[PDB]
Amino acid sequence: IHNANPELTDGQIQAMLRRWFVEVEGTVKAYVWDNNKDLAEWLEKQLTEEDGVHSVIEENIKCISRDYVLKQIRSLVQANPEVAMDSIIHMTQHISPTQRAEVIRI
Amino acid sequence: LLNSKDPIDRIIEFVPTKTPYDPRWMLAGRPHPTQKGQWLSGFFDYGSFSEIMQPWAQTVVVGRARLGGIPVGVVAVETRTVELSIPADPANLDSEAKIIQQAGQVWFPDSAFKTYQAIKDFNREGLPLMVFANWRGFSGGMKDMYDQVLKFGAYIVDGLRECCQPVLVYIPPQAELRGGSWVVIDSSINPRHMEMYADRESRGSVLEPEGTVEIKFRRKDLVKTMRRVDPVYIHLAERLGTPELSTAERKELENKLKEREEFLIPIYHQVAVQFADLHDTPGRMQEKGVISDILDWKTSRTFFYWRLRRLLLEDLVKKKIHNANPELTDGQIQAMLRRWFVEVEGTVKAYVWDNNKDLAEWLEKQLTEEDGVHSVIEENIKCISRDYVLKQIRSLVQANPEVAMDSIIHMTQHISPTQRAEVIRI
Amino acid sequence: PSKIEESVRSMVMRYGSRLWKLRVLQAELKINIRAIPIRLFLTNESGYYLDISLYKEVTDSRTAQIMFQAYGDKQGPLHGMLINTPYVTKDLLQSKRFQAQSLGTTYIYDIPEMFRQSLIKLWESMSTQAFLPSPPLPSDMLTYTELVLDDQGQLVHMNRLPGGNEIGMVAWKMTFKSPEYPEGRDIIVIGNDITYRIGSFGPQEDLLFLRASELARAEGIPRIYVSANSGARIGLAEEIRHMFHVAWVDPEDPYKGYRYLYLTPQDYKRVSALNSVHCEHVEDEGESRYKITDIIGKEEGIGPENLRGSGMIAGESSLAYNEIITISLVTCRAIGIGAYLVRLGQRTIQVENSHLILTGAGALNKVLGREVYTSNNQLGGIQIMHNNGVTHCTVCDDFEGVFTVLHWLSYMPKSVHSSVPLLNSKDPIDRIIEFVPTKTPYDPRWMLAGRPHPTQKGQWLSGFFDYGSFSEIMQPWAQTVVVGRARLGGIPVGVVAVETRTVELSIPADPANLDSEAKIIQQAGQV
Ligand SMILES: *C(=O)CCCC[C@@H]1SC[C@@H]2NC(=O)N[C@@H]21
């Protein structure tokens, strides 16, 4: 999680894990948190198994990482507009023709 | 920095001698012993020296001072013998108080730990270090080895590796660095900040001359030397080389040779240690590149003032460069500064680099003046910063195309209509 | 024949210590079976491994010459060799191996083999602690490549024969399979060659150390340093030593001093082109003289460049400790810089009868003016280094040292980017602890590891941690606290615990201060 968004603090990270556990397992199973065995097993299943269950927690982490890099991009261009048109070309090269149509349209 | 009333361009009136002396006399100065008034000046600004932790580990002196109005941390070495008094615990009626003699120019566990504390504290305080290094090595006796001298010697290295301020080591006159005491303050530990300078009356090597002759120039080789020097020994040795003189004559010649060669040992021993001393000179260190320069004592104040001023200004501009592009290394940053100096001033003026005064003034003009000359160096730094953030943008989108179209909109909003026309055109 | 092999193996191993002391390295036994002759050939080098080969004499040749034929499995060096091959007169490795063993230390190029054999012991030792897979054959347990310097100063991975080092430093990258990591973990091994210009860090040795440490940091893997050295290299400019003349104050009475040392033109003209000496021309006593002011020396590796280099590598070690695992093994001795290089790793294994010093006993006696010290072990031996917290563990020989290194490595990650290794322990997690701490003083080890059941003769009372997993370090230093490593359910952990019994701290007397006394101080527990 921290590598996905290095600007998070500890409380935020722990909150994300707690919420994800409840959201995936359910609210009735929310009590299964202060149980080291059960929760360790669940975490192991999310961390060790690939190409299969696919580890939903990994998907949430990927969402965080995506949004973080997006925020960095926006932050750099907004803090420094003078470079906006030097990168605008390169990021419109490796795109689908429909995406280019949207760039041209808008 | 202060505008000091002690001139920078003066000389030092106190000269360190070969006999033991108080290290404070060279740091601060002393009352002129001849007269009643008249103060003999030291290295640092008059009245600026303040010692700390004075009675603890008295073989080393640490404190704060000012050089030309520039605050510095100070480390120096006691060359007099001191007496460490250890009290008796009243809870152990079988204990005794003890007095231990501690020689100067030696690192003991206490003095090594004190030096570590000073270094770490001044690194956090934010001051450069001026070290007057005169250690002949570490104590290797049983009791200092038991009391963990090796550990604290390691701590010194770990302290110096984390310096962020200039560290200037100077070997005073009639001072030496030997063996273990060099390898722990060598500039290779922190090459970006550490520098070493030596006086002309300095020495530095692995082993003192006595320790070298005891290994490489033992008695057998001393005799071989005498074979080609002493006229008396030569005459006797040549006479004994004549075939078949007589039994009695050969016996007499052999006894004369034995007496002569034995009689001449102490003098050729002094010669031998002199020879070995010629290997420990600062000329050799300068040729090999382990020191930066050889300085004179009387004018060291001026030199170190202008050098420290240069280094501090360079640190300012280097920090700006690093913030513009944190992915640069040290060689790159220094090269950028060197090239910019030449490019702006011209190639004929390129020699004006190993001149601390001139280059300090140039750097100050680039750093202190705004809305005016406008500081061309700032423009180059801004170029670096712009390109760096541009590279970050390109890197993020190219490493992750899936976000390219989520930011494409926002960066095409706060633009001129012609820029939008170019976006649509493409 | 296999039974004869077993018999001879046991008989040689039990008396291997005596054979070692008598320098018996080769042995041959001729015996007839039933009749077919067989010839047993035994090589017993360094005292951890005994090599036994077996050959039959086969006469099926074209000439009247007879040759050896082995049994296919491990044919060995004498396969197809004539039975009348004479005995040779030592080789590349010998006469350097012999010197190193004559100093009480192992030769450097025998270190890889030790690792292999130690690993075997490791796979055996841990078989009582965890459910391990079948161990691979010894030929697959360790593979290494030697790290050498090129002409530019960079590392080259090279496979060559042992004993081909041109400098006093050797290093390897080793990959090996351990019980905790049976897929391969990497280490970097660095060692001094005691026989090359006795000990003595030069610039090239320093450079190799630096580059190998850099490799370790770049890969994030452990660094193992084997210390057998004599500190920084020194020397004297011999090209001047036989040329100089003394300018005496009184050439007839040399006991009123001399003024300077000088070269004559005949000597100066032969060295001025080398930048070996700096002189200035003077006229004195009606003679043309070149007065010596500085000596540089034409030979590289003896001057102040060794100070820089030493400091350089010291800095490297200080960095390495904060990024990777650093372990140091002391096999012969370390002087000066060598000691610091050990200390900066902060994980020291010290072989019996070795010492870590900064100054030798002879030097101290020369300084102090009397025969204060007799041995260097009085200055840096176990009785000092192991009791003041420098040495973590002591071992009897080099082989046990290698084993201890591997043992420690079994608790920790294979790299700085890996997790802690977990084992499938044979000690159940779900049991209870059979030892209960009492109100009265007790040994902390009893609750950590357990104790023999005092009621019976068998029966171990279990403790907190996995049975047999506890390993204490720095035991005799500051005995009021116990520190070590252990495993909980196969999970390695660091352990801190407190002594509740009273202990006695014995402080020795310094022989250099005749007014000093040894002291015993009672240290209470829980303080
Ligand atoms: C002085 O020339 C060097 C002093 C080195 C330390 C000496 S040697 C014996 C004493 N024991 C000890 O711990 N320090 C003293």
What tokens appear for C426 in the block?
């044979």
| Residue A102 in tokens | 């949207």
Residues B403, C511: Cα–Cα separation, whole Å: 75
Q: Which residues of B touch C241 (CB under 8 A)?
A: 217, 221, 225, 275
Cβ pair A90:B398 closer than 8 A: yes
Distance CA C275, CA C291 (A): 15
Task: Give ∠ CA A16-A17-A23 in degrees, rounded to 5.
Answer: 85
**Residue bearing the CA closest to ligand 1, atom 12:** B141
Return the SS3 of C460.
Answer: strand
Please name the helix (run of DSSP H) or strand (run of DSSP E) that holds residue C133, with its range, or none: none
Interatomic CA distance for residues B308 and B130, integer angstroms: 10
At position C399, the amino acid (one-letter code) is F
Counting one residue from chain B and one from chain C, the pairs whose CB atoms sit within 8 A come to 197
Pocket flag, ligand 1, residue B149 (CB < 6 Å): no
C308: phi > 0 → left, psi -120 to 50 → alpha, else beta; which? alpha
Cα–Cα distance for residue pair B360/B340, rounded to 1 Å:
15
- Adjacent-strand bridge partners of B70: B67
3-state per-residue secondary structure call for chain B = CCCCCCCCCCCCCCCCCCCCCCHHHHHCEEECCCCCCCEEECCCCCCCCEECCCCCCCCEEEEEEEECCEEEEEEEECCCCEEEEECCCCCCCCCCCEEEEECCCCECHHHHHHHHHHHHHHHHHCCCEEEECCCCCECCCHHHHHCCHHHHHHHHHHHHCCCCCCEEEEECCCEEEECHHHHCCCCCCCCCCEEEEEECCEEEECCCHHHHHHHHCCHHHHHHHHCCCCHHHHHHHHHHCCCCCCHHHHHHHHHHHHHHHHHCHHHHHHHHHHHHHCCCCHHHHHHHCCCCEEECCCCHHHHHHHHHHHHHHHHHHHHHHHHHCCCCCHHHHHHHHHHHHHHHHCCHHHHCCCCHHHHHHHHHHHHHCCCCCCCHHHHHHHHHHHHHHHHHHHHHHHHCHHHHHHHCCHHHCCCCHHHHHHHHHC
Angle at B46 between CA B43 and CA B48, to 5 degrees: 95
Neighbours of B381 (CB within 10 A): 19
Cα distance from B377 to chain A (closest Cα, Å)?
Answer: 20
Nearest to C310 by CA among C223, C194, C209, C198: C209
Q: Dihedral of CA B95/B96/B97/B102: which sign?
A: negative
Reported resolution in A? 2.5
HEC profile of C336-399: CHHHHHHHCCCCEEEECCCCEECCCHHHHHHHHCCCCCCCCHHHHCHHHHCCCCCCCEEECCHH
Q: Is B218 annotated as a binding residue?
A: yes
Pick among B403, B416, B424 to test the A interface (most A CBs inside 10 A): B403
Beta-bridge partners for C493: C486
Q: Quote the CA–CA distance of B10 and B68 in Å, as a whole number.
A: 10
The most distant pair of C-alpha atoms in chain B lies apart, rounded to whole Å, by: 120
| Helix, strand, or coil (residue C424) | coil
To 10 degrees, what angle do helices B149-160 and B109-125 make? 20
E strand or H helix at C523: strand C519-523
CA–CA separation, C420 and C410 (whole Å)? 10
Put simply, the answer to whether A106 touches B409 (Cβ < 8 Å) is: yes
Token pair 């269950």 is found at: A53
Tokens 């300084």, located at residue: C367
What's the B140 CA to ligand 1 centre distance in angstroms? 6
Nearest CA in chain A to B402: A66
The answer to whether the annotation marks B5 as part of a ligand binding site is: no
Exposed/middle/buried for C409, CB within 10 Å: 0-12, 13-18, 19+? Answer: buried
Inform me whether the C-beta atom of residue B416 falls under 8 Å from chain A C-beta atoms.
no
**HSE-up (13 A, CA, CB side) for residue C443:** 8
Calpha distance B385→B380 (Å, rounded): 9
C339 and B149 within 8 Å at the Cβ level: the answer is: no
Q: What is the dihedral sign for C-alpha C191, C197, C201, C203?
A: negative
Cα–Cα distance between C398 and C196 in angstroms, integer?
A: 19
Which atom of ligand 1 lies closest to the CA of B144?
13
Can you tell me whether residue C8 is helix, strand or coil? helix
Cβ of C512 closer than 6 Å to ligand 1, yes or no, is: yes
- The pairing of strands C277-284 and C348-351 is unpaired
Asked if B123 contacts B164 with a C-beta cutoff of 8 angstroms, the reply is: yes
CA distances from B308 to B51, B115, B123, B315 (A): 21, 22, 16, 10
Nearest CA among C105, C302, C107 for reference residue C201: C302
Ligand 1 binding pocket mutation candidate from B79, B139, B147 (most atoms within 8 A of CB): B139
Closest CA to ligand 1's atom 10:
B141
DSSP state for residue C50 in the 8-state scheme: -
Residue C201 Cα distances to B214, B335, C295, angstroms: 20, 33, 22
Asked if residue B187 lies in contact with residue B157, where contact means CB atoms within 8 angstroms, the answer is no
**Given CA atoms C494, C498, C499, C504 in this order, what sign does their dihedral have?**
positive
SS3 call for C411: coil
CB C66 within 8 A of CB C78: no
Tokens representing A55 are: 């580890």
Q: Do the beta carbons of residue C223 and residue C325 sit within 8 Å?
A: yes
A83 touches chain B (CB under 8 A): yes
β-strand pairing of B29-31 with B39-41: antiparallel
Scored b (16 or more CB within 10 A) or e, B174-184 reads bbbbbbbbbbb
User: Which among B356, B381, B354 has a CA at the least distance from the CA of B366?
Assistant: B381
Give the residue among C311, C293, C298 at the shortest CA–CA distance from C232: C311
Tell me which chains share at least 3 CB pairs under 8 Å with chain C. Answer: B
State the Cα–Cα distance between residues B276 and B268, nearest whole angstrom: 12
Strand partners, C55: C39
Region of B68 please: left (phi>0), alpha (psi -120 to 50) or beta.
left
Q: Which helix (H) or strand (E) holds C464?
A: none
Q: Which of B150, B205, B231 sits opposite C390 (nearest CB)?
A: B150
**Amino acid (1-letter code) at residue B223:** V
Residue B1 CB neighbour total at 10 angstroms: 10
Residue C2: partners with Cβ closer than 8 Å, 6 or more residues away: none
B174: its two tokens: 């009639």
Cβ–ligand 1 distance for C514 under 6 Å, the answer no
Q: Which residues of B34-47 are buried (b: 16+ CB within 10 A; e: fewer)?
A: eeeeeebbbbbbee
∠ CA C330-C334-C335, rounded to 5°: 165
Contact C367, B138 (CB under 8 A): no
Whether the Cβ atoms of residue C276 and residue C236 lie closer than 8 Å to each other: no
Cα C318 to Cα C171, C230, C345: the distances in Å are 19, 21, 8
**Residue C520, beta-bridge partner list:** C506
- The distance of A104 to chain B (nearest Cα, Å) reads 4
Q: Which of residues 351-390 of B touch C (CB under 8 A)?
A: none
| Pocket of ligand 1 contains residue B106 by CB under 6 Å | yes
Closest approach of C220 to chain B, Cα-based (Å): 20
Distance (Å, whole) CA C214 – CA C284 = 56
Tracing tokens 């270190």 back to the chain, one arrives at C111
Alpha carbon separation from B413 to A74, A77, B386, B419, B420 (Å, rounded) = 12, 11, 20, 10, 8
* Residue C269, φ and ψ in degrees, nearest 5: -65, -20
Residues recorded for chain C? 527
C-alpha closest to that of C189 among C99, C125, C116, C105: C116
Q: B20 and B79 in contact (C-beta within 8 Å)?
A: yes
Query: Helix, strand or coil for residue A81?
Result: helix
- C278: tokens are 């700096």
- In this structure, the residue with its CA closest to atom 2 of ligand 1 is C367
* Alpha carbon separation from B255 to B37, B261, B315, B348, C253 (Å, rounded): 65, 10, 72, 73, 20
Q: Report the C-alpha gap between B157 and C311 in whole angstroms.
A: 9
Closest atom of ligand 1 to CA, residue B137:
3
DSSP element (H, E) containing C156:
strand C155-158
- Neighbouring CB atoms inside 10 A of C342's CB total 28
CA distance B135 to C331: 30
Chains touching B, CB cut-off 8 Å, 3+ pairs:
A, C
Query: Three-state SS for C266?
Result: helix
The identity of residue B113, as a single letter, is F
Whether B408 sits inside 8 A of A85 (CB atoms) is: no
Widest Cα–Cα separation across chain A? 56
Q: Ligand 1 atom closest to Cα of B142?
A: 13
Distance (Å, whole) CA B138 – CA B126: 28
| A64 close to A3: Cβ distance less than 8 angstroms | no
- The minimal CB distance from B148 to the residues C358, C373, C388 is found for C388
Nearest atom (ligand 1) to Cα of C510:
11
- Do C and B touch, 3+ Cβ pairs within 8 Å? The answer is yes
Within 10 Å of residue B403's Cβ, how many Cβ atoms?
Answer: 22
Instruction: Identify the experimental approach.
Output: cryo-EM
CA distances for B40 relative to B13, B27, B112, angstroms = 5, 11, 30
| CA atoms of C227 and C331, how far apart (whole Å) | 6
Whether A84 and chain B come into contact, CB under 8 Å, resolves to yes
Which residues of chain B neighbour A82 with C-beta distances below 8 Å? Answer: 386
Distance in Å, CA B134 to ligand 1 centroid:
17
- Dist. CA C14–CA C8, nearest whole Å: 10
Contacts of A58 (CB under 8 A, 6+ apart): A46
Taking phi over 0 as left and psi of -120 to 50 as alpha, with beta for the rest, C369 belongs to left
Instruction: Note the residue count of chain A.
Output: 106
By the 8 A CB rule, do B204 and C305 touch? no
Amino acid at C176: F
Residues of B in contact with A84 (CB under 8 A): 411-412, 414-415, 419
Q: What is the CA angle C358-C359-C364, rounded to 5? A: 155
Helix axis angle, C111-125 to C398-409, nearest 10°:
60
In whole angstroms, what is the distance from residue C348 CA to residue C331 CA? 11
